[PDB]
């Protein structure tokens, strides 16, 4: 018997299946913020205070180092992660302890209006330069002041960390020992600024969060969108203007660079302060199972944590492009692994937001970012 509390901020469907096979166990969803940094700030407060209310925590792929070192989670003792994609086995392992079980993979893709590219004879762009030239050509034809060339995240949210690193990684650089490439940091901030200055992105991109990009593209207002796999279900759902009008490509590269992307995804941890440790673990073993991974791929376009589900016939029937997504996820670059990740994120996202709001130049942004990261890495 148990009333379990899960922090998830279609999962209700998965929880109803567990309840239907587990008599005397009911599960209630709890929330605290939309974007991941908001969820982190909240969980820091209640975990710091040893709050026993939550049993299971849905945590971002960037969280296990913090949660492990603070002793905020109950480790899966003797657990083998070898069935999961190795990138997620590694992320959920800290000094040899299994901190959490993978919930779903994720990576950033380029969503595009394949109807608009097709009308203008344009191929999916492989460089930001090709994306600019495509946007200009489509915008000149459409004469549509509501049509944005490129939606990307400029709000001071976790997503803007990812935004900063896409061009940095593309140029072949790494952040981590801190290894700050100033030229590539300014080049990243200049690129995102250049879309606002050129009109290819809207004047207030600094106000745009992950799900703003999702809603605006879904409403038919965006040619090109940087986003995560979950967007797909919404694009092809009942309140979309873009059903059957969406292509998915690897992100453009910077001139002469690689088509790199950011690793994302989430995992289920058990709270160290949970009073229902045994039933919490059993719920997490169900939620991290292959059957539930498959259900979440088909019903919510969450990329699987199991390699085999990428080319499972029921998964590809629903989302054909998942068959091409496995190597993108497998090769995706990771945000720095550190217990102090919240300080890394805070520095990077506020610098991106400031540059895009015009509050600081890319040059001053990069300098201030490097000074702040030095005290943290
Ligand atoms: C039914 C459940 C749907 C939720 C699936 C996507 C959640 C957002 O997660 C993605 O974006 C984060 C940035 S942000 O949007 O929080 O700024 C990244 O950190 C994550 O790694 C990535 O998976």
Curated annotation (Swiss-Prot):
Q: Where are the transmembrane segments?
A: none
Principal localisation: periplasm
Origin superkingdom: Bacteria
- Locate the residues binding 3-(6-sulfo-alpha-D-quinovosyl)glycerol: 36, 60, 106, 159, 210, 265-266, 335
Induction comment: Induced during growth on sulfoquinovose.
Which keywords has UniProt assigned to this entry? Answer: Periplasm, Signal, Sugar transport, Transport
What InterPro entries would the database entry show?
Answer: Bact_solute-bd_prot1, SBP
Annotated 6-sulfo-D-quinovose binding lies at 265-266, 335
Q: Name one Pfam family in it.
A: SBP_bac_1
Report the GO terms under cellular component.
Answer: periplasmic space
Q: Does the keyword Signal apply?
A: yes
Keyword Cell membrane listed? The answer is: no
| Compartment annotation | Periplasm
User: What biological function has been recorded for the protein in this entry?
Assistant: Part of the ABC transporter complex SmoEFGH involved in sulfoquinovosyl glycerol (SQGro) uptake. Binds sulfoquinovosyl glycerol (SQGro). Can also bind sulfoquinovose (SQ), methyl alpha-sulfoquinovoside (SQMe) and a short-chain derivative of sulfoquinovosyl diacylglycerol (SQDG). Cannot bind D-glucose and D-glucuronic acid.
What the entry says about domains is:
Binding of ligand results in a large conformational change in the protein, and complete enclosure of the ligand.
Q: Family membership, please give it.
A: Belongs to the bacterial solute-binding protein 1 family.
Task: Describe its partners and assembly state.
Answer: The complex is probably composed of two ATP-binding proteins (SmoE), two transmembrane proteins (SmoG and SmoH) and a solute-binding protein (SmoF).
Protein name per the record:
Sulfoquinovosyl glycerol-binding protein SmoF
Task: List the source organism.
Answer: Agrobacterium fabrum (strain C58 / ATCC 33970) (Agrobacterium tumefaciens (strain C58))
């Amino acid at each position: 018997d148990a009333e379990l509390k899960i922090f998830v901020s279609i999962w209700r469907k998965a929880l109803d299946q567990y309840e239907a096979k587990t008599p005397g166990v009911k599960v209630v969803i709890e929330t605290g913020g939309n974007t991941s940094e908001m969820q982190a700030q909240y969980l820091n407060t209640v975990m710091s205070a040893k709050d026993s209310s939550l049993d299971v925590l849905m945590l971002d792929v960037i969280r296990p180092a913090q949660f492990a070192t603070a002793g905020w989670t109950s480790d899966f003792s003797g657990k083998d992660l070898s069935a999961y994609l190795p990138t997620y086995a590694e992320a959920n392992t800290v000094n040899g302890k299994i901190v959490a079980l993978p919930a779903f993979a994720d990576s950033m893709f380029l969503y595009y209006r394949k109807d608009l590219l097709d009308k203008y004879g344009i191929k999916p762009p492989t460089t930001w330069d090709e994306l600019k030239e495509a946007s200009k050509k489509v915008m000149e034809g459409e004469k549509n002041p509501e049509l944005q060339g490129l939606s990307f995240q400029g709000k001071a949210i976790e997503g803007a960390v990812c935004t900063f690193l896409l061009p940095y990684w593309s140029e072949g650089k790494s952040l981590v020992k801190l290894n700050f490439d100033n030229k590539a940091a300014v080049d990243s901030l200049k690129l995102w600024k250049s879309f606002v200055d050129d009109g290819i992105s809207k004047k207030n991109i600094s106000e745009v969060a992950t799900d703003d990009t999702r809603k605006e593209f879904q409403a038919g207002k965006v040619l090109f969108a940087v986003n995560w796999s979950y967007a797909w279900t919404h694009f092809q759902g009942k309140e979309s203007q873009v059903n059957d009008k969406v292509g998915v490509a690897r992100l453009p590269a910077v001139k002469g660079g690689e088509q790199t992307t950011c690793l994302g995804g989430w995992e289920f941890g058990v709270s160290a302060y949970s009073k229902q440790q045994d039933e919490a673990k059993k719920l997490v073993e169900y939620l991290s199972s292959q059957d539930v991974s498959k259900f979440m791929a088909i019903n919510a376009a969450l990329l699987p944590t199991y390699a085999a589900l990428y080319k499972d016939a029921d998964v590809t029937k629903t989302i054909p492009w998942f068959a091409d997504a496995l190597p993108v996820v497998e090769t995706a670059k990771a945000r720095p692994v550190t217990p102090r990740y919240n300080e890394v994120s805070e520095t990077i996202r506020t610098t991106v937001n400031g540059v895009l709001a015009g509050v600081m130049t890319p040059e001053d942004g990069a300098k201030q970012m490097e000074s702040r990261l030095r005290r943290v890495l």
